[PDB]
């Protein structure tokens, strides 16, 4: 697994990068921020994250912000694949509760 501290600082930087890019309602995507987003996310694309770390570090929430309308689909696909992987690794019945409460 990954340490809580790595996930937590990465989550904080992701959220700060996200908030910086919002010009009011509109997402502004610089070359440098596009590249900073990829760098932060690709450190998490190799992490095995536990349910407890999802609860405590909020790393899934911080990655999920980049599924919003203003971000390039290259970044949105990356965020989606990272979260898909973490969700699938959860125990099957945990997947079922989170899903069933949602239907």
């Amino acid at each position: 697994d990954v340490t809580n501290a790595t996930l937590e600082t990465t989550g904080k930087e992701l959220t700060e990068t996200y908030m910086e890019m919002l010009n009011g309602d509109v997402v502004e995507v610089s070359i440098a921020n596009e590249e900073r987003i990829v760098s932060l996310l690709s450190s998490l694309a190799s992490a095995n994250v536990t349910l407890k770390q999802l609860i405590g570090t909020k790393i899934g929430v911080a990655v999920g912000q980049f599924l919003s309308d203003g971000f390039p689909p290259h970044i949105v696909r990356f965020s989606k694949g990272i979260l898909d992987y973490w969700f699938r690794q959860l125990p099957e019945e945990v997947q079922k509760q989170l899903l069933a409460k949602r239907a």
Partner: peptide
């Protein structure tokens, strides 16, 4: 208990 939104944010879906 935890919801999918608690863990993955309000935009994620399976």
């Amino acid at each position: 208990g935890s919801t999918l939104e608690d863990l993955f944010g309000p935009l994620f879906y399976v």
